[PDB]
Amino acid sequence: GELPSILSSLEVEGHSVRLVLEVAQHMGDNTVRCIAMDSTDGLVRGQKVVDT
Amino acid sequence: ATDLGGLQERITTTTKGSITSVQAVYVPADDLTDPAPATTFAHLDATTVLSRSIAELGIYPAVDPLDSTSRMLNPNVIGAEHYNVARGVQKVLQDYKNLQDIIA
Amino acid sequence: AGYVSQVIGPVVDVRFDGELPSILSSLEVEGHSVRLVLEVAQHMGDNTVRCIAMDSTDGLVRGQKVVDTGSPIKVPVGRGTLGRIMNVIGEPVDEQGPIDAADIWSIHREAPEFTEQSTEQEILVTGIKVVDLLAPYQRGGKIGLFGGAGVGKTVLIMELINNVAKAHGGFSVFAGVGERTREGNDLYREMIESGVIKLGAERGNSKCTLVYGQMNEPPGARARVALTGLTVAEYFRDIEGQDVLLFVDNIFRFTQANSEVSALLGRIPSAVGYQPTLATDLGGLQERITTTTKGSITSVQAVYVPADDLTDPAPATTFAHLDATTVLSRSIAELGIYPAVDPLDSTSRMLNPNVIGAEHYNVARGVQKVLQDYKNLQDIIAILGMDELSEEDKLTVARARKIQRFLSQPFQVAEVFTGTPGKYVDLADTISGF
Amino acid sequence: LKLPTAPLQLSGTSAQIATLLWQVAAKENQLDKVQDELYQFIELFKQHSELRRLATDPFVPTLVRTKIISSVLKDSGASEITKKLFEALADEGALSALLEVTVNYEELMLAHKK
Amino acid sequence: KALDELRKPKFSSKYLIQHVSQKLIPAVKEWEKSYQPPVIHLGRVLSVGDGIARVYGLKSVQAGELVCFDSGVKGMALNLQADHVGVVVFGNDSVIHQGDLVYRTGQIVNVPIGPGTLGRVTDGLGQPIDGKGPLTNVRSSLVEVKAPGIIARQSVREPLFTGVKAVDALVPIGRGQRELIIGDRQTGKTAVAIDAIIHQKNCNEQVPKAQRVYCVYVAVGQKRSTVAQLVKLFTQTGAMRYTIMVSATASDAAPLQFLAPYSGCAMAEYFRDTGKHGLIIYDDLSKQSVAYRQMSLLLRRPPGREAFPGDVFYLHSRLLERAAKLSKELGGGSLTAFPVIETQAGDVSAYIATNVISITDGQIFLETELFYKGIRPALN
Amino acid sequence: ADAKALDELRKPKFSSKYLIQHVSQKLIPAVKEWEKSYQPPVIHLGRVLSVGDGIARVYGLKSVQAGELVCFDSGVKGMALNLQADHVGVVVFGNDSVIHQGDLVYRTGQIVNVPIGPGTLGRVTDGLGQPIDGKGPLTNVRSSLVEVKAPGIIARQSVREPLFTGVKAVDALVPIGRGQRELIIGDRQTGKTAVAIDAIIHQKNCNEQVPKAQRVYCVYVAVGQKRSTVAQLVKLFTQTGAMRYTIMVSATASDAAPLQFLAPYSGCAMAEYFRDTGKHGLIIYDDLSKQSVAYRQMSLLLRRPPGREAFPGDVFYLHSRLLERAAKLSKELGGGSLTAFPVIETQAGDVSAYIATNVISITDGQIFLETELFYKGIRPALN
Amino acid sequence: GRVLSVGDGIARVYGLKSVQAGELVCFDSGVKGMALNLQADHVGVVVFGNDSVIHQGDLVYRTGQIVNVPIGPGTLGRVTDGLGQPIDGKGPLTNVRSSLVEVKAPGIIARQSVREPLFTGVKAVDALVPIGRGQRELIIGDRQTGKTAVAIDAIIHQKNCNEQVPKAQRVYCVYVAVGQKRSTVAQLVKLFTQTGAMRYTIMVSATASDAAPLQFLAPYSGCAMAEYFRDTGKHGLIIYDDLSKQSVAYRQMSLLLRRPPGREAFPGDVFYLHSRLLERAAKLSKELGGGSLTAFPVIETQAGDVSAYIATNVISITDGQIFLETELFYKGIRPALNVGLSVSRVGSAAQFPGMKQVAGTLKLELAQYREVAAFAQFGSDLDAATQYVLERGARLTEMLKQKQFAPIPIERQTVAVYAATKGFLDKVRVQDIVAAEEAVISQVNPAVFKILKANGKITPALDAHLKAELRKVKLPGA
Numbered sequence A: 001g002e003l004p005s006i007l008s009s010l011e012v013e014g015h016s017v018r019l020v021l022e023v024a025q026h027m028g029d030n031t032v033r034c035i036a037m038d039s040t041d042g043l044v045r046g047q048k049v050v051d052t
Numbered sequence B: 001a002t003d004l005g006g007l008q009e010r011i012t013t014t015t016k017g018s019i020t021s022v023q024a025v026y027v028p029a030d031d032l033t034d035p036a037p038a039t040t041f042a043h044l045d046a047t048t049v050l051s052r053s054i055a056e057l058g059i060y061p062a063v064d065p066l067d068s069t070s071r072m073l074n075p076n077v078i079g080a081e082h083y084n085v086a087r088g089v090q091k092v093l094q095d096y097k098n099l100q101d102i103i104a
Numbered sequence C: 001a002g003y004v005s006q007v008i009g010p011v012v013d014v015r016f017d018g019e020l021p022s023i024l025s026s027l028e029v030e031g032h033s034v035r036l037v038l039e040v041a042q043h044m045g046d047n048t049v050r051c052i053a054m055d056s057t058d059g060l061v062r063g064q065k066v067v068d069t070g071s072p073i074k075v076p077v078g079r080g081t082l083g084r085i086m087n088v089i090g091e092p093v094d095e096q097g098p099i100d101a102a103d104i105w106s107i108h109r110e111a112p113e114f115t116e117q118s119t120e121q122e123i124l125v126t127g128i129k130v131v132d133l134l135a136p137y138q139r140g141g142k143i144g145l146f147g148g149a150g151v152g153k154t155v156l157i158m159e160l161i162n163n164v165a166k167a168h169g170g171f172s173v174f175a176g177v178g179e180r181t182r183e184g185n186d187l188y189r190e191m192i193e194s195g196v197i198k199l200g201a202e203r204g205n206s207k208c209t210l211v212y213g214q215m216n217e218p219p220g221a222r223a224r225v226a227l228t229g230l231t232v233a234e235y236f237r238d239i240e241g242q243d244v245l246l247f248v249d250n251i252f253r254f255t256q257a258n259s260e261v262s263a264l265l266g267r268i269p270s271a272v273g274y275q276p277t278l279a280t281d282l283g284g285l286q287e288r289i290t291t292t293t294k295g296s297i298t299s300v301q302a303v304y305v306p307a308d309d310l311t312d313p314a315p316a317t318t319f320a321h322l323d324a325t326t327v328l329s330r331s332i333a334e335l336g337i338y339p340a341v342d343p344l345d346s347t348s349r350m351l352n353p354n355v356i357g358a359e360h361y362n363v364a365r366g367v368q369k370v371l372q373d374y375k376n377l378q379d380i381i382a383i384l385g386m387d388e389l390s391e392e393d394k395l396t397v398a399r400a401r402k403i404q405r406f407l408s409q410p411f412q413v414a415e416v417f418t419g420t421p422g423k424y425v426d427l428a429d430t431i432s433g434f
Numbered sequence D: 001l002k003l004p005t006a007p008l009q010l011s012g013t014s015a016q017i018a019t020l021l022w023q024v025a026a027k028e029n030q031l032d033k034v035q036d037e038l039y040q041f042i043e044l045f046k047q048h049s050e051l052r053r054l055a056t057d058p059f060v061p062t063l064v065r066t067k068i069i070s071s072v073l074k075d076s077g078a079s080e081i082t083k084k085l086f087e088a089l090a091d092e093g094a095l096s097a098l099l100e101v102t103v104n105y106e107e108l109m110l111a112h113k114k
Numbered sequence E: 001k002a003l004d005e006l007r008k009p010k011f012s013s014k015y016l017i018q019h020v021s022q023k024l025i026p027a028v029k030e031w032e033k034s035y036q037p038p039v040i041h042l043g044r045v046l047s048v049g050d051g052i053a054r055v056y057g058l059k060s061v062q063a064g065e066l067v068c069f070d071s072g073v074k075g076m077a078l079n080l081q082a083d084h085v086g087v088v089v090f091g092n093d094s095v096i097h098q099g100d101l102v103y104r105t106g107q108i109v110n111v112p113i114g115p116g117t118l119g120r121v122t123d124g125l126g127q128p129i130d131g132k133g134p135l136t137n138v139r140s141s142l143v144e145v146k147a148p149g150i151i152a153r154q155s156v157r158e159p160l161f162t163g164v165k166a167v168d169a170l171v172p173i174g175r176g177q178r179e180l181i182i183g184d185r186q187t188g189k190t191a192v193a194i195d196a197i198i199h200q201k202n203c204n205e206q207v208p209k210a211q212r213v214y215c216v217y218v219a220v221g222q223k224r225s226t227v228a229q230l231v232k233l234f235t236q237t238g239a240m241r242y243t244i245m246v247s248a249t250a251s252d253a254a255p256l257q258f259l260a261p262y263s264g265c266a267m268a269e270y271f272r273d274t275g276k277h278g279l280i281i282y283d284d285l286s287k288q289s290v291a292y293r294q295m296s297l298l299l300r301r302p303p304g305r306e307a308f309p310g311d312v313f314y315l316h317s318r319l320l321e322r323a324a325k326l327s328k329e330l331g332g333g334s335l336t337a338f339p340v341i342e343t344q345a346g347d348v349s350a351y352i353a354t355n356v357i358s359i360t361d362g363q364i365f366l367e368t369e370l371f372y373k374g375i376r377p378a379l380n
Numbered sequence F: 001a002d003a004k005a006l007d008e009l010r011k012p013k014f015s016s017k018y019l020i021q022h023v024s025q026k027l028i029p030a031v032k033e034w035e036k037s038y039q040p041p042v043i044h045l046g047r048v049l050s051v052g053d054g055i056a057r058v059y060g061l062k063s064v065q066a067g068e069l070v071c072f073d074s075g076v077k078g079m080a081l082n083l084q085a086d087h088v089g090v091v092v093f094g095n096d097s098v099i100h101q102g103d104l105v106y107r108t109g110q111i112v113n114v115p116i117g118p119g120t121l122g123r124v125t126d127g128l129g130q131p132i133d134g135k136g137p138l139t140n141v142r143s144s145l146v147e148v149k150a151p152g153i154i155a156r157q158s159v160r161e162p163l164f165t166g167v168k169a170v171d172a173l174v175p176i177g178r179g180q181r182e183l184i185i186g187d188r189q190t191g192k193t194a195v196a197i198d199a200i201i202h203q204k205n206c207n208e209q210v211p212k213a214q215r216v217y218c219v220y221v222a223v224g225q226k227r228s229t230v231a232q233l234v235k236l237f238t239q240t241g242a243m244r245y246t247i248m249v250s251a252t253a254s255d256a257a258p259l260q261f262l263a264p265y266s267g268c269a270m271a272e273y274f275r276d277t278g279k280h281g282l283i284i285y286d287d288l289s290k291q292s293v294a295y296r297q298m299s300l301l302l303r304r305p306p307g308r309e310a311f312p313g314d315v316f317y318l319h320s321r322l323l324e325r326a327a328k329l330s331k332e333l334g335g336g337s338l339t340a341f342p343v344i345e346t347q348a349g350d351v352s353a354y355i356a357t358n359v360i361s362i363t364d365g366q367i368f369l370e371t372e373l374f375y376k377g378i379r380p381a382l383n
Numbered sequence G: 001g002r003v004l005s006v007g008d009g010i011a012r013v014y015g016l017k018s019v020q021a022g023e024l025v026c027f028d029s030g031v032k033g034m035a036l037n038l039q040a041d042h043v044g045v046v047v048f049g050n051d052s053v054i055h056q057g058d059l060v061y062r063t064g065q066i067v068n069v070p071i072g073p074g075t076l077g078r079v080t081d082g083l084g085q086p087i088d089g090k091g092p093l094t095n096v097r098s099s100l101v102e103v104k105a106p107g108i109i110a111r112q113s114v115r116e117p118l119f120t121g122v123k124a125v126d127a128l129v130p131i132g133r134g135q136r137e138l139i140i141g142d143r144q145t146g147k148t149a150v151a152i153d154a155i156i157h158q159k160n161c162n163e164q165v166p167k168a169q170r171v172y173c174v175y176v177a178v179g180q181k182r183s184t185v186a187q188l189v190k191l192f193t194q195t196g197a198m199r200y201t202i203m204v205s206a207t208a209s210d211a212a213p214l215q216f217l218a219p220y221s222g223c224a225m226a227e228y229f230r231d232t233g234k235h236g237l238i239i240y241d242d243l244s245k246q247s248v249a250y251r252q253m254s255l256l257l258r259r260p261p262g263r264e265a266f267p268g269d270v271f272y273l274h275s276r277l278l279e280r281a282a283k284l285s286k287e288l289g290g291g292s293l294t295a296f297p298v299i300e301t302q303a304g305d306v307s308a309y310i311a312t313n314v315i316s317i318t319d320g321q322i323f324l325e326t327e328l329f330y331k332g333i334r335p336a337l338n339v340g341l342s343v344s345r346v347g348s349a350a351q352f353p354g355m356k357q358v359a360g361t362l363k364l365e366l367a368q369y370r371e372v373a374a375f376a377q378f379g380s381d382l383d384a385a386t387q388y389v390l391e392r393g394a395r396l397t398e399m400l401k402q403k404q405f406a407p408i409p410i411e412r413q414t415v416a417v418y419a420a421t422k423g424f425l426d427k428v429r430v431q432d433i434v435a436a437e438e439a440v441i442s443q444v445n446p447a448v449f450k451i452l453k454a455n456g457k458i459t460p461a462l463d464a465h466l467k468a469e470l471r472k473v474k475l476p477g478a
């Protein structure tokens, strides 16, 4: 619940480096689609993503 | 091709009457190899091909004298006096087309 | 075991409720006017394979029983295939009974591994002076053949077959990839009436296996016929331990057929129009034609250049494998010189003083220099006169004119219609005479 | 043949199954009988993992997936149109379409309830 | 929550409603009494449009089999897919609706071959269109037959005289080869073809019965004015005694223009397989490839170069490999093919042009700059 | 078909249970009747849904990382490329014919890595670090990631040391710094490999007379080549003794396009051991224009939209993130370096092609080898 | 309606069951929209602004109205955005009225023949490529040629003509600036205020940072403002600077509404994108007022390749064509008008009768000069009757030159063409015929320009008296 706005930055917790996701789209089923400012190697499909 | 054919095949003479059809065809970028003029070419009895270079020489109607064809240009249809004059005119114009490469 | 789900042209989907066949496995269709063999291309999910047919799929019904064979297309292989015509799935086409198989081998096979590779890079001597002097064939290499009609290409092919089988004791395979049936029948008859293929009880004394895939075959059938010819050569290489020749006729048609197979399977085409897997489908073929520690396979592959464009991706990808090119030209042929190998246009990666020695290298480079500086005064021969020349350039004209005569050679297979007997030439004789 | 009109026109491929499920339950007058046993199957998927394995797992066989369905729906609240539905939804692996087909069944229902 | 995996359904078929509609309307007790749509040898039209009908059912139809709709308009089952059949229509799809019954005929596509075909102007499916009655002295034969192999052939030695001096002198043609007639628009390709046919009529009055050549002219994508004019030419010359004419015209459906060269080749193979000689001319084989591209793009088959399918080379090669010179143990008969490819601006590096240049033996290249130079036949 | 109108269907709303306890007592005997027809359910392992074109779609694998080396039960290894909501897209490092639908996919728990260290020196490995020279497994080695990010601005310094290549035309006219990247671009058969081989043999000749910290350890990445050429090259390096200092990563023409794509990254990972430990490396990516073709095949088989010439559009990033790892590190990072020699084959001298101009925008210079100078005997045919 | 998904300036909206195709919608974040893809499950809404203020589940209210703009005389002098709303900071649009932006173009009975001329003031144009009121004339060219400069001079010249004609035959200009910078259009309002041409000029400007449905809609918004003058007996002139940039914004919306791409990526409907718009430039009959609208679409080519997809659409829509070349631009020929390719399908029937007779030979003498300069490029021979053709043709190409922001009325043009096509500028060096014709306009008295303008034609009472004064002039060199 409470989807972030488009262009908001999201922080991924539990990554090796600081991974920042900028929201690009609202996909439609409470899913945002983001662009990553770092490499996404190591991202697991349950990882906590904190809205800023 | 089948949409264009289903149109063009209705424009015919029947044993009831006749339809004499003159259809302007736009070639898109002075390009006779585009599929819409290249599909129309097989449907026509006489193709008056107008060319840009003849218009830019000041000659109007800018009909390409070589690239224009008709099925009526047979000697057993229009006679031999018309046919030999037309073939000689096209022969002289193709000779000058070959000679304009070496004159210029 | 499985059953036909879809038939989209040459592409069949088969549904196995049991366990699925492996990719590249061969499937047979139960009940069909011709034996229909399907080769599994991919697993689509939901218990479905997608296959490519080796024959026509007309008359194929959704739900026809399809039997998995547990292996790829297995072809009859061995010395009993010599002098036979065999199609892509191994059936005899020459209407002379079954093929006496020493073994049956799957046509899909990885290349020889890195430790089985040979590191030596030496000559396959052919007995033809121009292609052993000016463009030597690497033993275990690939050779482009830029011939055509009326340049004596067929006589050159069967002379290479005859010379290698006589001197080196190794057989030959002809892969007719995408062949005209008229030209394939002409090659079969010209191999019968020249003694490289014999019939009947003298079948075993023949020197060449013909593996044919015609133009009227579906693209999966003629996309795999080169693998069948390569399996027939790989038995002689691995099990017999011989120096085999392979003749992939028109490697461009191999490329074309794999392009059509990739297009029918739904893949997005890469550059100019080709399969995305162009380099990989070519390297899957061309990397099994190497020298192993047992023997070698050498390929004389006819090369077609599509728009007379050597930068087109099919010849550009093919030339990355070719160790030599043999250009047959009409201008040498209507000069009466046979074989019509262009001595200046023919190239070889083997023509290098660290693999053929400085003597062979300097003799060949000298013959090339003499022919080249003769063939660039021809536009002053005509406009000034043949006796306008200096006294030294006339010596080069008189040397090159007798060099290019000496490049011709009478062939052993051509003596049934030329009368003059054929002369095998050794390498030392060629170097010393030239 | 004939079929009763739907109250409202609605979407495709899961909302046209629900239109047809409403269009045969309106003829058999068990319109609110099919609706509660649609809610029962949603509760059945909640507390049984081996029943939702017949809707989400792609590796269950299409014969095994349709034989468990008919061997648990045997003449007990069967209604013959939520029983022949579930063979037809396990014949194509569309048992996962149940949470989507009941939502469209409800919005067809209160349009009938006015 | 544990039902978010059931939140998103995913289906293996677009026609999921057609199975639950076959399992729910016989589940109401009023229409259970003998109301079920049959699926084995019948089918319902799901979609129509642009000469392609998607058909639900026909579980026993074969790939490439003729089907018949309710309206009598025929079709060919071309995409057998996992739940529906992709049927190409042999007419106008104005008379096909959603829900129409599609009966399978149980036969792959047939044409009447035999000596009763000589003189008759037929459709691309063997229906006579000259208004002269049904074909009498004929016999039904399959349209796509396998070409004869290596051992069923012999070499091409006997000449096929075209009657054209440039062709008979410079690019000679034998009984059994395939020679391409390629050139631009209005360069004289049809004229070379018709000169070959008329010269065969002039030769058949002077040779024994087994040296005679029977012509087949396949007019694909031409207009009916051109085809009627050409039949008038053949009847005023007398060449129609030895000529069959297959004519799938421009108004005809795209499957008829695709199947007309194969229909003409099956009619012309009657002479080859019974020891006589044939000469087939596939006029506008480029128009056949255009019609096949239409049917394949409308069947959503994956497009390749220029839009063409993967098997358009297979199309033209399995057509043109049927022109052979058979061995003496199969009669010694012959079929000589003249495919006609129209190029644009002389571009012989086009897709279908390079395909047919690869397939055929020679080529007769006609140029337009030679055509208006006075050189007619304009053979380059 | 709303979402808040579907979450309201989570709560029970039936109040009539004549079918819940009808089937709840009949479900377990039905499941036990069809029990040997079940494959065992899979959550943390994986199972192959569909395999084809060298891409396996894998159900399960609930906790794989993106870019993680997975293992099929055939033994052939993969890489978890795109993790999706229901499956995982895996690119198969090898032939995809040994993979079937229903095969168990085992997660190895580590992002795609290769063995790096001193014990990989002398050895001919494949594109994934597995040795193909037949002389055993890699001892005295440790695994490290192939897709490590290049060092930043503050971890670098200017090139100072001169890295002699032994070629007179190159070392006179086009001199190569120690942490440089220099492109060897030319047509086919114009001596592009020979310049790199002369650099490697010269580094063998120079290593015998430098005080152990100016030694340059080469890596040769042979992408897309023939296997006989790689065999002759390894024979040449052992004949001259150069193999004591070089590694030979080779993903040949018959190898799968994920292996040809990944072989420069594994080679650069092996050479980054020498860069990151104060020593000096030299790496030759022989025909990076074949790595671009293997990556284009991978991208078009993933149905990614093609761009210029057919290439995916991150084909610049493919070569940029590879070549940026050839740095000259600072004094507080050891002072190590890595010199790159990417090789690009042009067609008919067209250097304004796509991949050529991509790598010209990455590297620090070019070594042009003209075919006209090569045919006239001027060898090395340096433009 | 609730927003299902939003991204890239497209919102997919569930609901709005009675929304019309092309109807303006309203988001609860205040941003506007237009319903384009009416599908059975969602509505594809393009967003007039930034889509970052829209989330999933926002409310979309339909406004019940098709997209409209404020039209009327209160738009003159005002710089508006892509649909009506002013951005010059001068308050709301007073004295204005709403009207739809997608109107059916006037049909065959609503037209009459294009007879009266629209003077560009560019004498390369007004002599060789004449333009009548009610004609669409395409200004096509390569990247930095004189394309907007011809368009700027046609607007500046209307201010120079509106002060001297009666109230009826005044031309009110509209400049539609699609996809440009705000900096570029701020230099144009600065230019139109400095000359004074902003009194008769609306300035619709959907710039580069604007949303793609504002750049795709701005020519229709601008044409609806210009059509007020056409529908009320007055005369409009609309300039769509970069219709090539209006098609790139339309391709963006189409490819994001998942409509399948065609040629180069464009939708199939892209010919109908511009033919719907350019057919609204008409010349109405006297039963409808006799108003006119003259369009000047601008199309940018890439390497002079006029065989592009959008370039060949507009060439077949518009009546004329003004092709500007870069290799003529750098040879000093400004305006860089290619005389050979530039057509005007209204012909000489809609131009100045004073220049209908002196510039018919100008386009004939320049046709000869093009041919003899291709052969003398080699350096073969001259014939002293071929060289006179090469002599006079070089006088005329220096005569057709014009500098940047100064249009010439109509009668100092045709006097300057009279001085060149009658030999009166022979024995003047080719380097300074540009400098020679300031003397011909200065020294000849302004009494003759009033007779030429009021007659519209050089009468023999003027024609002899003109050349009587065209000898009493100090040309340079002499």
Ligand SMILES: Nc1ncnc2c1ncn2[C@@H]1O[C@H](COP(=O)(O)OP(=O)(O)OP(=O)(O)O)[C@@H](O)[C@H]1O
Pocket (backbone or CB within 6 Å): B041, B042, B069, B070, B071, B073, B074, E184, E185, E186, E187, E188, E189, E190, E191, E192, E342, E376, E377
């Ligand atoms: N040998 C010839 N001598 C004189 N004229 C000829 C000759 N052959 C053909 N023509 C003329 O050429 C024109 C075109 O010929 P034809 O229709 O045979 O060629 P085509 O390439 O098939 O044309 P299309 O492609 O339009 O059908 C006809 O008008 C015909 O009169």
Ligand SMILES: Nc1ncnc2c1ncn2[C@@H]1O[C@H](COP(=O)(O)OP(=O)(O)OP(=O)(O)O)[C@@H](O)[C@H]1O
Pocket (backbone or CB within 6 Å): C320, C349, C352, F187, F188, F189, F190, F191, F192, F193, F194, F195, F345, F379, F380
């Ligand atoms: N400096 C040199 N002097 C003489 N010959 C040379 C020299 N360098 C290379 N050659 C010869 O040129 C041939 C091609 O060399 P090399 O393999 O290095 O080029 P390449 O660019 O790798 O070609 P390809 O990429 O097609 O393999 C080799 O046979 C080699 O013998």
Ligand SMILES: Nc1ncnc2c1ncn2[C@@H]1O[C@H](COP(=O)(O)OP(=O)(O)OP(=O)(O)O)[C@@H](O)[C@H]1O
Pocket (backbone or CB within 6 Å): G142, G143, G144, G145, G146, G147, G148, G149, G150, G300, G334, G335, G402, G403, G404
């Ligand atoms: N008649 C002229 N005389 C001298 N200079 C001119 C003339 N016309 C244009 N220029 C100069 O040429 C340049 C380009 O003019 P203009 O602004 O018309 O280009 P454009 O075609 O709109 O190019 P773009 O579309 O890139 O803006 C301007 O800087 C202008 O100063």
Ligand SMILES: [Mg+2]
Pocket (backbone or CB within 6 Å): E189, E190
């Ligand atoms: Mg014709």
Ligand SMILES: [Mg+2]
Pocket (backbone or CB within 6 Å): F192, F193, F286
């Ligand atoms: Mg190399």
Ligand SMILES: [Mg+2]
Pocket (backbone or CB within 6 Å): G147, G148, G149, G241
């Ligand atoms: Mg501008």
